[PDB]
């Protein structure tokens, strides 16, 4: 019954997810894995369905990790969906500062793909700016991809001076 739940959560079918989650005894099916190790929380957050991820958090799910260290917030920032992002941030605050296998945060992906409102949403909250495995901040990762709107809305922000402070004096690519 894991594959019907994965298909129903991956496409926002809310009534099928309510019918499958009627028996609330066993939660091993709720946080089960995939071939790529993604929970139904990850599938609902990847495509940006806010009511499904709200229902799964109300029934009780765990912020597990992908095989590549991703989280639900990493997928919601990779996609640029502000609603699911806002729901995940309104539930818990201990999920924001989180590293993948490469040291990126959600703000790194949200600045890399050029989603301005996602960067402003993670930046209105405390984002905990940190470097990469290659010592690249999110601002440099936005500048190397020529994303005009996100660096403009970082300039309009109030954290800009702090965003100016951090870089590496030794790397040739990051200056």
């Amino acid at each position: 019954k894991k594959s019907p739940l994965h298909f129903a959560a991956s496409y926002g079918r809310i009534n099928t997810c309510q019918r499958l989650l009627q028996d609330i005894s066993d939660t091993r099916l709720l946080n089960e894995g995939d071939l790529h190790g993604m929970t139904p929380l990850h599938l609902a957050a990847k495509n940006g369905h806010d009511k499904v991820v709200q229902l799964l958090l109300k029934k009780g799910a765990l912020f597990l990790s992908d095989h590549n260290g991703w989280t639900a917030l990493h997928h919601a920032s990779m996609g640029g969906y502000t609603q699911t992002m806002k729901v995940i941030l309104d539930t818990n605050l201990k999920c924001t500062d989180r590293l993948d296998e490469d040291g990126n945060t959600a703000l790194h992906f949200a600045a890399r793909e050029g989603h301005a409102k996602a960067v402003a949403l993670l930046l209105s909250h405390n984002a905990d700016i940190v470097l990469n495995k290659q010592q690249a901040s999110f601002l440099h990762l936005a500048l190397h991809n020529k994303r005009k709107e996100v660096v403009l809305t970082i300039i309009r922000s109030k954290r800009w001076d702090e965003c100016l402070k951090i870089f590496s004096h030794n790397s040739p690519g990051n200056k």
């Binding site: 594959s3 019907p4 496409y11 926002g12 079918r13 809310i14 495509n47 369905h49």
Partner: peptide, 16 residues
């Protein structure tokens, strides 16, 4: 609109 179609579509005899 296409994502809305998949969200509201009825699936019988193609499940699992």
């Amino acid at each position: 609109l296409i994502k809305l179609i998949i969200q509201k579509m009825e699936i019988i005899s193609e499940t699992e």
